[PDB]
Design an enzyme around this catalytic site. Structure first.
Site, PDB file in Angstrom:
ATOM      1  N   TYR A   1       0.803  -1.237   0.000  1.00 52.84           N
ATOM      2  CA  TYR A   1       0.000   0.000   0.000  1.00 52.84           C
ATOM      3  C   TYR A   1       0.837   1.290   0.000  1.00 52.84           C
ATOM      4  CZ  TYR A   1      -2.393  -3.677   2.922  1.00 52.84           C
ATOM      5  OH  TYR A   1      -2.815  -4.857   3.512  1.00 52.84           O
TER       6      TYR A   1
ATOM      7  N   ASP B   1       1.203  10.310  11.453  1.00 51.78           N
ATOM      8  CA  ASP B   1       0.861  11.152  10.306  1.00 51.78           C
ATOM      9  C   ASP B   1      -0.603  11.615  10.240  1.00 51.78           C
ATOM     10  OD1 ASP B   1       0.252   8.812   7.656  1.00 51.78           O
ATOM     11  OD2 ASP B   1       0.594   8.299   9.759  1.00 51.78           O
TER      12      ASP B   1
ATOM     13  N   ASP C   1      -2.046   8.778  15.352  1.00 49.07           N
ATOM     14  CA  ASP C   1      -0.785   8.163  14.935  1.00 49.07           C
ATOM     15  C   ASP C   1       0.117   9.208  14.301  1.00 49.07           C
ATOM     16  OD1 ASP C   1      -1.868   8.515  12.332  1.00 49.07           O
ATOM     17  OD2 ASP C   1      -1.059   6.625  11.602  1.00 49.07           O
TER      18      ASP C   1
ATOM     19  N   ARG D   1      -5.449 -14.200   8.295  1.00 51.27           N
ATOM     20  CA  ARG D   1      -4.982 -13.637   7.033  1.00 51.27           C
ATOM     21  C   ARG D   1      -3.473 -13.400   7.118  1.00 51.27           C
ATOM     22  NH1 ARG D   1      -3.976  -8.411   7.673  1.00 51.27           N
ATOM     23  NH2 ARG D   1      -3.768  -7.926   5.410  1.00 51.27           N
ATOM     24  N   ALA D   2      -2.811 -13.284   5.968  1.00 49.17           N
ATOM     25  CA  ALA D   2      -1.421 -12.875   5.964  1.00 49.17           C
ATOM     26  C   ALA D   2      -1.310 -11.348   5.987  1.00 49.17           C
ATOM     27  CB  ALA D   2      -0.706 -13.448   4.761  1.00 49.17           C
ATOM     28  N   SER D   3      -0.357 -10.839   6.773  1.00 51.99           N
ATOM     29  CA  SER D   3      -0.021  -9.423   6.788  1.00 51.99           C
ATOM     30  C   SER D   3       0.687  -9.089   5.484  1.00 51.99           C
ATOM     31  CB  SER D   3       0.903  -9.115   7.982  1.00 51.99           C
ATOM     32  OG  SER D   3       1.615  -7.890   7.817  1.00 51.99           O
ATOM     33  N   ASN D   4       0.401  -7.911   4.941  1.00 53.41           N
ATOM     34  CA  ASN D   4       1.039  -7.500   3.696  1.00 53.41           C
ATOM     35  C   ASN D   4       2.344  -6.771   3.895  1.00 53.41           C
ATOM     36  OD1 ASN D   4      -2.220  -7.231   2.827  1.00 53.41           O
ATOM     37  ND2 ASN D   4      -0.842  -8.371   1.464  1.00 53.41           N
TER      38      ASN D   4
ATOM     39  N   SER E   1       4.703   7.006   8.730  1.00 49.55           N
ATOM     40  CA  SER E   1       3.495   6.686   9.546  1.00 49.55           C
ATOM     41  C   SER E   1       3.726   6.679  11.074  1.00 49.55           C
ATOM     42  CB  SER E   1       2.744   5.422   9.024  1.00 49.55           C
ATOM     43  OG  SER E   1       1.348   5.425   9.423  1.00 49.55           O
ATOM     44  N   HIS E   2       3.595   5.522  11.704  1.00 50.80           N
ATOM     45  CA  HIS E   2       3.737   5.406  13.155  1.00 50.80           C
ATOM     46  C   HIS E   2       5.084   4.773  13.596  1.00 50.80           C
ATOM     47  CE1 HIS E   2       2.226   1.517  11.811  1.00 50.80           C
ATOM     48  NE2 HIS E   2       2.643   1.006  12.958  1.00 50.80           N
TER      49      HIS E   2
ATOM     50  N   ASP F   1      -3.638  10.000   9.817  1.00 50.16           N
ATOM     51  CA  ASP F   1      -4.666   9.190   9.114  1.00 50.16           C
ATOM     52  C   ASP F   1      -5.360   8.123   9.989  1.00 50.16           C
ATOM     53  OD1 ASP F   1      -2.566   7.306   9.197  1.00 50.16           O
ATOM     54  OD2 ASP F   1      -2.405   7.059   7.044  1.00 50.16           O
ATOM     55  N   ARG F   2      -4.906   7.995  11.234  1.00 52.98           N
ATOM     56  CA  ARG F   2      -5.533   7.116  12.227  1.00 52.98           C
ATOM     57  C   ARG F   2      -5.872   7.925  13.483  1.00 52.98           C
ATOM     58  NH1 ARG F   2      -0.646   3.596  12.641  1.00 52.98           N
ATOM     59  NH2 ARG F   2      -1.394   3.069  14.743  1.00 52.98           N
TER      60      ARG F   2
ATOM     61  N   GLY G   1      -7.909   1.509  12.616  1.00 56.22           N
ATOM     62  CA  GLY G   1      -8.226   2.855  13.043  1.00 56.22           C
ATOM     63  C   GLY G   1      -8.315   3.893  11.932  1.00 56.22           C
ATOM     64  N   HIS G   2      -8.213   3.452  10.678  1.00 56.17           N
ATOM     65  CA  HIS G   2      -8.418   4.337   9.521  1.00 56.17           C
ATOM     66  C   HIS G   2      -9.909   4.460   9.259  1.00 56.17           C
ATOM     67  CE1 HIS G   2      -4.255   4.323   7.742  1.00 56.17           C
ATOM     68  NE2 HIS G   2      -4.170   3.212   8.453  1.00 56.17           N
TER      69      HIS G   2
ATOM     70  N   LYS H   1       3.387   7.659   0.397  1.00 54.37           N
ATOM     71  CA  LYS H   1       2.039   7.272   0.043  1.00 54.37           C
ATOM     72  C   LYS H   1       1.659   8.145  -1.152  1.00 54.37           C
ATOM     73  CE  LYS H   1       0.913   6.008   4.810  1.00 54.37           C
ATOM     74  NZ  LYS H   1       0.150   6.491   5.994  1.00 54.37           N
TER      75      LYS H   1
ATOM     76  N   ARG I   1       8.143   2.188   1.925  1.00 55.92           N
ATOM     77  CA  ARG I   1       8.726   2.470   3.246  1.00 55.92           C
ATOM     78  C   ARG I   1      10.150   1.939   3.367  1.00 55.92           C
TER      79      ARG I   1
ATOM     80  N   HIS J   1      -5.439   0.500   3.460  1.00 59.33           N
ATOM     81  CA  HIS J   1      -6.027   1.820   3.207  1.00 59.33           C
ATOM     82  C   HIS J   1      -6.300   2.086   1.744  1.00 59.33           C
ATOM     83  CE1 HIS J   1      -2.523   4.311   1.766  1.00 59.33           C
ATOM     84  NE2 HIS J   1      -1.858   3.305   2.309  1.00 59.33           N
TER      85      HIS J   1
HETATM   86  O1  LIG Z   1       0.015  -5.059   7.664  1.00 58.25           O
HETATM   87  P1  LIG Z   1      -1.415  -5.424   7.346  1.00 58.25           P
HETATM   88  O2  LIG Z   1      -2.106  -6.168   8.464  1.00 58.25           O
HETATM   89  O3  LIG Z   1      -1.605  -6.054   5.982  1.00 58.25           O
HETATM   90  O4  LIG Z   1      -2.171  -3.993   7.219  1.00 58.25           O
HETATM   91  C1  LIG Z   1      -2.113  -2.982   8.247  1.00 58.25           C
HETATM   92  O5  LIG Z   1      -1.402  -1.787   7.842  1.00 58.25           O
HETATM   93  C2  LIG Z   1      -2.034  -0.816   6.970  1.00 58.25           C
HETATM   94  C3  LIG Z   1      -1.251   0.500   7.095  1.00 58.25           C
HETATM   95  O6  LIG Z   1      -1.604   1.460   6.083  1.00 58.25           O
HETATM   96  C4  LIG Z   1      -3.532  -0.586   7.250  1.00 58.25           C
HETATM   97  O7  LIG Z   1      -4.195   0.001   6.118  1.00 58.25           O
HETATM   98  C5  LIG Z   1      -4.263  -1.869   7.619  1.00 58.25           C
HETATM   99  O8  LIG Z   1      -5.586  -1.522   8.034  1.00 58.25           O
HETATM  100  C6  LIG Z   1      -3.516  -2.612   8.727  1.00 58.25           C
HETATM  101  O9  LIG Z   1      -4.210  -3.794   9.149  1.00 58.25           O
HETATM  102 ZN   LIG Z   2      -0.816   6.727   9.754  1.00 59.11          ZN
END
Ligand SMILES: O=P(O)(O)O[C@H]1O[C@H](CO)[C@@H](O)[C@H](O)[C@H]1O
Ligand SMILES: [Zn+2]
EC number: 5.4.2.2
Length: 458
Positions: A12, A239, A237, A416-419, A103-104, A241-242, A323-324, A113, A15, A303
């Site tokens: 997304y 920046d 957070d 789910r897998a984290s991206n 971000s955080h 956005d949360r 939190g978005h 972004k 970084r 996001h």
């Molecule tokens: O790392 P994840 O779990 O795929 O994704 C995570 O980071 C993103 C940061 O922008 C957010 O939009 C997702 O809501 C959050 O769950």
């Molecule tokens: Zn943020």
């Protein structure tokens, strides 16, 4: 163009760790890549914003130059919150914008972004820029820079459209991130008394990291809210956005609860409206949305993926467990913690109950926080595939648009897998403690069937 590290190009955003995987050279070429793609979509005008990280002032010059060297017309909006940059790319001449933010994350992280011609980039679009740099598929021109003082325009936009019914007392915690530039000022302008916490913009983050998703980063806001007999605590957070919410009695409000309140308010004004939520959100959201005549849409975590989905469905509101919160009603459809805070205060000011009782009025279930299992980058998607292919869940509605989610009569679970990290992300909710434990046992067995070495911590 040099050979940039592929790891910094993510699902997304982009970084990296500055001076290490993210240098002045990296930022320049990323700017070249974003300028060429925006020009290919017919957009020469690009807003540029940065957060309050130590590397901001230096690296943003390189980003700006890379865009200028395409022939782009850059609108430099200086140091602003992420959503103020998304707002720039909605009200200025161009519909492209780049936000230089980490971000955080720890002080040394920074990144990008990107919005190009109205679209927030994800997945393949991010790789498409990476590939432009590899291929030298880059535009060349003599561009321009103009300074744009945009914050007062944003401030005024929110202030004019929000209408609080009574004054409130609000502790605002910005965790020394860039939210400090406007959140305390604006909330006060809406008709509040503001107790500030960590509101000076300091990229060293000398207090707690600006990450309201971890409850320990809300300890101080919670203590301050009680100490000062305040009506509400708010936390942003890095920046902006949360947002994170604490009641007058110190209760942390999970973002899917926050969405319920927003969803009730937006649907009530717009019968039939679509309302989006991610797969980590409580099932109560479906019932509450449908009850008021809205159309509940469950979607992917992320996001950029949520923003795309809102354009496709015409949803008036969206929210993520992270939190978005994305308002289209009365707004522009991008995530914005500061605008969301304003919308929360507006609703709360109209209730004769304190914030604790307004939110406790949605009742409860038994739920887990987010759980994380560290796997490998080699295996993380394969495990999910294996579960989606071959797992047996028993009787339930199985959803697979992002990992596997199964909604049983008396509860639900998700994997789910984290991206962004080599981890599996789980959440569970249920009517009863026994049912919670029944579902957790199903998921444990299913993961163990894929790989009996996986560290299931439940
Ligand atoms: O790392 P994840 O779990 O795929 O994704 C995570 O980071 C993103 C940061 O922008 C957010 O939009 C997702 O809501 C959050 O769950
Ligand atoms: Zn943020």
């Amino acid at each position: 163009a040099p050979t940039l590290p592929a790891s910094i190009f993510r699902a997304y955003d982009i970084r990296g760790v500055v001076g290490d995987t993210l240098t002045a050279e990296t930022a320049y070429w990323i700017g070249r890549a974003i300028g060429s793609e925006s020009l290919a979509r017919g957009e020469p005008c690009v807003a540029v914003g940065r957060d309050g990280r130590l590397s901001g002032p230096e690296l943003v010059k390189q980003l700006i130059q890379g865009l200028v060297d395409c022939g782009c017309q850059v609108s430099d909006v200086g140091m602003v919150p992420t959503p103020v940059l998304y707002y720039a790319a909605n009200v200025l001449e161009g519909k492209s914008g780049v936000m230089l933010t980490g971000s955080h994350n720890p002080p040394d992280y920074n990144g990008f972004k990107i919005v190009v011609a109205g679209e927030t980039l994800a997945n393949e679009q991010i790789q498409a820029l990476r590939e432009r740099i590899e291929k030298n598929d880059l535009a060349s021109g003599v561009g321009s820079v103009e300074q744009v003082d945009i914050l007062p325009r944003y401030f005024k936009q929110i202030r004019d459209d929000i209408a609080m019914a009574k004054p409130m007392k609000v502790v605002v915690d910005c965790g020394n991130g860039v939210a400090g530039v406007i959140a305390p000022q604006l909330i006060e302008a809406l008709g509040c008394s503001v107790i500030p916490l960590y509101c000076e913009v300091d990229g060293n983050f000398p207090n707690h990291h600006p990450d309201p998703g971890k409850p320990e980063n809300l300890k101080d806001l919670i203590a301050k809210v009680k100490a000062e007999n305040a009506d509400l605590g708010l936390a942003f957070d890095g920046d902006g956005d949360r947002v994170g919410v604490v009641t007058n009695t110190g209760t942390i409000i999970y973002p899917d609860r926050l969405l319920m309140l927003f969803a009730k308010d937006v649907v009530s004004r717009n019968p039939g409206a679509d309302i989006i939520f991610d797969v980590k959100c409580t099932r109560r959201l479906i019932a509450l949305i449908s009850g008021y005549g809205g159309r509940p849409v469950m979607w992917k975590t992320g996001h950029s993926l949520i923003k795309k989905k809102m354009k496709e469905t015409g949803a008036l509101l969206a929210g993520e467990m992270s939190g978005h919160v994305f308002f289209k009603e009365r707004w522009f459809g991008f995530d914005d913690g500061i605008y969301s805070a304003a919308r929360l205060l507006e609703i709360l000011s109209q209730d004769q109950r304190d914030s604790e009782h307004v939110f406790s009025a949605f009742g409860s279930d038994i739920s887990t926080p987010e759980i994380n299992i560290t796997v490998t980058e080699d295996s993380k998607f394969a495990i999910i595939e294996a579960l989606q292919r071959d797992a047996q869940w028993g009787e339930g509605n199985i959803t697979t648009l992002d990992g596997v989610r199964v909604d049983y009569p008396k509860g639900w679970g998700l994997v789910r897998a984290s991206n962004t990290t080599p981890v599996l992300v789980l959440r569970f909710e249920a009517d009863t403690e026994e049912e919670l434990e029944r579902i957790k046992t199903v998921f444990r067995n299913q993961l163990k069937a894929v790989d009996s070495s996986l560290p299931v911590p439940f």
